[PDB]
Design a binder for this molecule. Sequence first.
Ligand SMILES: Nc1ncnc2c1ncn2[C@@H]1O[C@H](COP(=O)(O)OP(=O)(O)OP(O)(O)=S)[C@@H](O)[C@H]1O
Ligand SMILES: Nc1ncnc2c1ncn2[C@@H]1O[C@H](COP(=O)(O)OP(=O)(O)OP(O)(O)=S)[C@@H](O)[C@H]1O
Ligand SMILES: Nc1ncnc2c1ncn2[C@@H]1O[C@H](COP(=O)(O)OP(=O)(O)OP(O)(O)=S)[C@@H](O)[C@H]1O
Ligand SMILES: [Mg+2]
Ligand SMILES: [Mg+2]
Ligand SMILES: [Mg+2]
Ligand SMILES: [Zn+2]
Ligand SMILES: [Zn+2]
Ligand SMILES: [Zn+2]
Lengths: 367, 360, 368, 366, 343
Amino acid sequence: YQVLARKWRPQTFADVVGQEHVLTALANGLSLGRIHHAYLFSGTRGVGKTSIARLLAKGLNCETGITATPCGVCDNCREIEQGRFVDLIEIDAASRTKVEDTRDLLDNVQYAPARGRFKVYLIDEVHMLSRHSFNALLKTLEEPPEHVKFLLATTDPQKLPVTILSRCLQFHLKALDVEQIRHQLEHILNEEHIAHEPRALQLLARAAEGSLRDALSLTDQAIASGDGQVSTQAVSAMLGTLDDDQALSLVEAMVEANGERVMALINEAAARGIEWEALLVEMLGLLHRIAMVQLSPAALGNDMAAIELRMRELARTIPPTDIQLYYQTLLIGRKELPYAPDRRMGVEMTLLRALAFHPRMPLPEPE
Amino acid sequence: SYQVLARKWRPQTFADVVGQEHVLTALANGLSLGRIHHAYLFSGTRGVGKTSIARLLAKGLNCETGITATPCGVCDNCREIEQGRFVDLIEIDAASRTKVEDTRDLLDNVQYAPARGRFKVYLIDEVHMLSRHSFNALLKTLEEPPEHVKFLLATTDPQKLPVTILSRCLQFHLKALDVEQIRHQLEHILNEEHIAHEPRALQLLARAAEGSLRDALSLTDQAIASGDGQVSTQAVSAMLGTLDDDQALSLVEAMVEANGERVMALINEAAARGIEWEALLVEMLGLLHRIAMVQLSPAALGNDMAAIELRMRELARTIPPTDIQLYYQTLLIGRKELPYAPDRRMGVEMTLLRALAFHP
Amino acid sequence: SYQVLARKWRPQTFADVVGQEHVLTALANGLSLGRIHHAYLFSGTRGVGKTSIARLLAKGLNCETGITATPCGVCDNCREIEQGRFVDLIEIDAASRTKVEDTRDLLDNVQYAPARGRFKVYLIDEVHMLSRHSFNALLKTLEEPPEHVKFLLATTDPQKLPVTILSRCLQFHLKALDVEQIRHQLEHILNEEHIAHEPRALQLLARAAEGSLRDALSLTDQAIASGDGQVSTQAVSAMLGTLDDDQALSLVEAMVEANGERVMALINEAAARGIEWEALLVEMLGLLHRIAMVQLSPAALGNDMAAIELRMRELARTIPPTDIQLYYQTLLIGRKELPYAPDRRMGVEMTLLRALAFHPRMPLPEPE
Amino acid sequence: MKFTVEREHLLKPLQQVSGPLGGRPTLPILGNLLLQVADGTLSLTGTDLEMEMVARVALVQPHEPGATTVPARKFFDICRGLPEGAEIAVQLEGERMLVRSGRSRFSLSTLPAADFPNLDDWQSEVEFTLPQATMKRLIEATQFSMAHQDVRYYLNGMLFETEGEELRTVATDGHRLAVCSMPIGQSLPSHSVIVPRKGVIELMRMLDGGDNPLRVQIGSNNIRAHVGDFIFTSKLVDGRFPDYRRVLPKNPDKHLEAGCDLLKQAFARAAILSNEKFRGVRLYVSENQLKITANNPEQEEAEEILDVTYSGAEMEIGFNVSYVLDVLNALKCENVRMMLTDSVSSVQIEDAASQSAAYVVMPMRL
Amino acid sequence: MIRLYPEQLRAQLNEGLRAAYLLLGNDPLLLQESQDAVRQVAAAQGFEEHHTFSIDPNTDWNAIFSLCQAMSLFASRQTLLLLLPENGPNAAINEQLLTLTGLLHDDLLLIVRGNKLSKAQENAAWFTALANRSVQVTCQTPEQAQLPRWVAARAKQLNLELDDAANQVLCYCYEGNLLALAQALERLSLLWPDGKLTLPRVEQAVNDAAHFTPFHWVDALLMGKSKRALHILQQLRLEGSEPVILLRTLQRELLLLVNLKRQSAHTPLRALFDKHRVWQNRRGMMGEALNRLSQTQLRQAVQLLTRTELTLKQDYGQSVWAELEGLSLLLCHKPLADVFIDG
Ligand SMILES: Nc1ncnc2c1ncn2[C@@H]1O[C@H](COP(=O)(O)OP(=O)(O)OP(O)(O)=S)[C@@H](O)[C@H]1O
Ligand SMILES: Nc1ncnc2c1ncn2[C@@H]1O[C@H](COP(=O)(O)OP(=O)(O)OP(O)(O)=S)[C@@H](O)[C@H]1O
Ligand SMILES: Nc1ncnc2c1ncn2[C@@H]1O[C@H](COP(=O)(O)OP(=O)(O)OP(O)(O)=S)[C@@H](O)[C@H]1O
Ligand SMILES: [Mg+2]
Ligand SMILES: [Mg+2]
Ligand SMILES: [Mg+2]
Ligand SMILES: [Zn+2]
Ligand SMILES: [Zn+2]
Ligand SMILES: [Zn+2]
């Protein structure tokens, strides 16, 4: 019943998917004993900044000692897992943004930790602190007490002062790869004994750009929609993204200058009950993929492999100039869609623009 | 006490809601299976059932007969929620509660157990109006809240919210209701209200609803007030300023054939009769789209315009498709800038003269 | 923990101070001749030794031996200063002490004689943040301080400070340590700690430090962490690649040389970094504008940036005005149409492709 | 470490040590009082860096020696909030302090005593006992003249000079100098030190008219006062107090002896009838006559005539009413003698009976 | 009523002190050194009191009156300094000053420091009363043209040797910051006792710490020196000055230039200048600006300025400085196709 994101939070360094460089650096630092007093974590949403920070806190305060492989069973590990560890001070920058609040926070830094071996501080979205707060924090960051560790975190590291950046070891977490997201989703679903299909996992991974938290949220929503199962049809309906084959056929009809097929395809889409702007976006994405394939050969991911060969044909037959013309026509039509009398009418008129100005086979021009 | 149709016909069960089948199915399945999230964000256009669906979910969660997919609507808590009395259902306005103390007390009272129900639902409306510091402070609550509070978020546009908020919330995209759904709902409401209605009037009201059912109900109430308690086609047409005549086609023909004097005379007489200019532009856009369609496929023309068939066909035989696209583009540009023009008449005249400038 | 390099390798004597030769000589002459000014202002950038030099001056001015330019480093005062627990060494920050009450308390406490130090040195930091009231109070107390008190101001942006403070204070603005000094200091630190390293890794660390010894120390600590107790060229290069945020300049270079695969690789790296795509487009547009202005006038490239000075200069001198104009126009069009693109990533890729391998058909002013 | 006391014995010393210590501390540990139990005595020091108030209490329970620092505010609140008459047992476990009182237990976080600012081992330059009455008289005589807020930081306090078997206090604010001397009775080396305004205020606050001999220790830069089982240490304000010897006129031949009460009531009447600020009152003294007139060019001249016992040369001097009123208030007696040289000179005020205290003021030029 | 300069003030003090002194100007170093010289001469004469007060409505005056009407217990012939407010005296301050002049005493040495008074503020009752015994030392900061001679004289007084290159470097680095210039001269003298300061000597121990005003930037653009305009823009950016005031100051002169250029087709320049009542010293500068650029310019400049304002107060970005320096280069004799700047 518990949310996937909360339930499947990492509890050991092995559980973390991706971010190999930061994990290796932290493990080596803990093992060799060359531990710095201020670590800054950066990246995008849901990449695992807080997860890695909490894993490091567990490693530092573990009963067995400072190690890169915390046991996960001693009292400190359990308390940190439950978020009820007294020494692990989870602070929010926005909660205390004024200089007075951060000074009050730093007033108690000197006191020894209650039971843990370090008084770890974990500040979330540290970039929200004011300039005065940063300057006040500089002195403690440079020379903190030997039993005090700072674990800053922020999605935007460019806002921090240069002094703060130089006073701490930076670790910029990278957006997780689509394959890594898909593998993690498959692993968690298999562990939870839930039926799933490869296409559904691919669609979910594509939907989650690089944030695994978004992937987990979308997976939970798909579980709800599909009544305990992750089916390709359910995920496609929830995402509102029709199958790539229909958009590919639409663009093939558009380039061939045969409007009858275009009309039939849009009628079928209307019967299916799919928002028209999504169809236009899919057509634009297909055109962009064709243009990229023309630019470079390896421009299509394995997810589109099922339709790669066909796509390549469109790259060879269709010149680049008319590809750009079609892309621009579709983009301007999407620009005009909100002000059109109807979404169907807007898409139909955009397709008629594309056909009328078709370079190879222009629509007949009666006087 | 008398209430407007929007308040009278607010859905009270998961079956009374029209459209949005996917989100309703997901919510019902989650409630049945017990896999309930702690953050439900609803994104969509106005008048699609944000507040209605949120209140239905709150009733389902807080029902005294356990967590039920379809709340009965008769319990003490169910009735209080229906009447907006339930203390555990805190309805917060984001725009009003933007100050620091508001959010600070919002995240400080979470620890207190619910007064009456089993969940202390927080229904935050138009969440995109909250300040950035508010989102930053509420991230922790939205991530790992206690197991007695559920956050229900409603926003017209979700992209404006911080990416972290979207990450920590389950997003439900309420699809804009189509014309058929709006027409069916209006027909059902009028039949249950013992009010006579014509199919043409219902179609016109659904078309003018622009995908929002609350707007459809407001237009129906306006027609009722103006239509002496009768939803008549003539009354709705007068209220909505719909030409539904050959004036639009004649003006389009004049525009295509230059002849600025005819266009000016048509606009002058239309202004004298006092019509809606946005309706005129929409009618012209529809006619141009139909001309393009018949140029592509002659079979795509209906019989409603039979009286004006041949003349329309003449355009399909006389205007090249590129010119049709140019005229449609100019009309859309006029549509976009019509609200911002010094006057509606000035905007329409500028659009029509710009279209007149175009010619083979 | 084995301490950290920045903390361990604080310069505890004037002899072991890297760079800042002019400031060091001036301070040594002042201490030897016995002429000490009322207030000192150490300015410059971060990680150059402003705080370190201020603490060196404080410990040499209150040393048990006397006012000497070569503090012993073993007496009670020197050891206490090094440990950072000397009572008379009053280190304060303008951040949380701009309040009227706090400034008044500091002014009142100034009059009291030092506890066990020859001088009661006040090491104020970030003086440019002092409010107008606090600034005026500081000026008034600096107008005629007691003979037993001293002020060692350490700012980072003297332009904010009005020259009134300089009217009663002696400034010793530091300069960037330059690559060679930073590399030599890193080599000495690593050798003294029995740490294996390669010369190219040290060169990369020094060049990446950007004229800041503290940044170099942090970077080499990161290299040790990722290098597993040994700095190597591959480890430092990988760390820099992960930490590099100059994707806009590299993309501009690739577009200039029409290297499509390089553009794709850089876009993939930026996606891994997860930077805002509109922000990336704006940064590239600004870089193109700066290149155009540098071509117009060499002085247009301000000294505020120096890591990409050579790249900017070579790009400006190489490409002609027309090509940079076309790149700027294409990037502007791409930025404008980005909201309606199928995806932000796709929009960026499309505009990059258009700029590097296409050209827009310009309009024609048809005769009237 | 371990000891046991009664909250009745700790309510007063805790209040005393925690009194001056207020507001935020410059250093976090300065916000904490250092309590140490040793040789049957518990000493609590509420250090303020600039000032240190130490209160000592007697221990009869089987304590254990030890020292530690603890925040003053919460410890005082804990001691005060317990039931009246309840005994408090304090112990140290790990880095925390446990407080037991009957059925109640509390735990407090304690910083190490090493980080506490140590009281340096400076040896007092001049140590001597003194009764409270003499010190209180000196403070009362030489506290109204010190400048409350002056650019010259050394004039904010007042200068104590010990010479031979004599202790002298001199205070001034740029216009008047009040000097009061008292024979100590024990020969001591010559030494001068300036005590700040806050230090003397705290010292006079400590005075309570008791029989405990007040022991004063003057150091290089610190002054310490022992009263019974209480210690007050302050840091002497630096600088150099101007020598008072040059200020004292040599031969103020002109003399004026008059009833102190008469002058007091005359000045009070002038002040109440001349409440307008500025415009120092002008007094014309003549043979058996003293006419005080308001200098206010706008307000009506509230001239007041008194029959003083003066029979010398007549002259008009533009004094400040508030200054003379305060000076005469500082000298509470029945008769007062003022000695001056000429129109432009420093008139010295003294008691017609006693001459230990001198009040060399100067006229306000008109 | 003697108007003097700080350079020759030492002789005036030596020949005899005056009852009233007042330092008027904007140069900080000149004011500070004049004040120090006057105070030292007073101390040598036998004045031990150096009371200082800041004029402000919040501040009281009873202490000032008491100290001016009273001597010192252990000194005599006090000296009082008054720090005028930056904006200038107001009616209440005028009343206070004339009151002070009313009861002013010879033993008191009056010194006044503050921004130079205006023509309207120049005339006053207290000023006229003090004119009988008033010596006013002009303390304005020398112009860029006057800077090289001033620094050369300063170096010669310090027994140093400066060449043309070193003088130019010092002027460039400390333009309008003569206090920092003198401090740098002292530092260089200490570093090299020989006294010969060649170009490497000065350049290896100097920093860019000049201070400017938006009027200086507009003047630089009018002259057309790109390096100076870029340098002043950099200094203003580092000082944190907001671009709104720079944009307004530029806009005023741009509109004036556009009007002059458009209306100069058939109208004499002299009549237009007389009608506009512009500064006499700026007549030649305006003529040079007008004849340096034709109507082809002053059109993309206005459009660029409007675009800058829109992108400033609508997009709220941080690239305003880039647009400002682009416009700066445009106003100079530069091609500036304007495609980059979107003029
Ligand atoms: N690198 C990762 N390895 C494993 N699971 C991950 C990772 N990143 C995210 N997850 C999953 O997604 C959840 C959210 O991860 P968090 O680390 O809490 O997100 P976050 O990055 O801290 O949020 P931000 O950055 O403050 S918006 C975790 O509980 C995991 O279930
Ligand atoms: N999906 C729907 N199903 C049934 N009735 C609806 C629906 N959407 C709107 N309505 C009607 O419109 C009234 C008000 O609309 P809401 O339910 O509040 O939709 P909404 O999206 O919350 O409106 P906004 O976003 O606050 S302007 C309801 O009381 C219903 O009568
Ligand atoms: N000139 C230098 N010589 C040797 N080590 C240096 C030097 N400058 C910095 N370091 C090293 O960097 C550490 C921190 O340098 P700091 O002196 O604090 O830099 P900084 O000038 O104080 O930066 P600010 O003032 O906080 S912005 C020192 O402890 C040294 O290890
Ligand atoms: Mg996080
Ligand atoms: Mg609503
Ligand atoms: Mg520093
Ligand atoms: Zn463990
Ligand atoms: Zn119920
Ligand atoms: Zn020493």
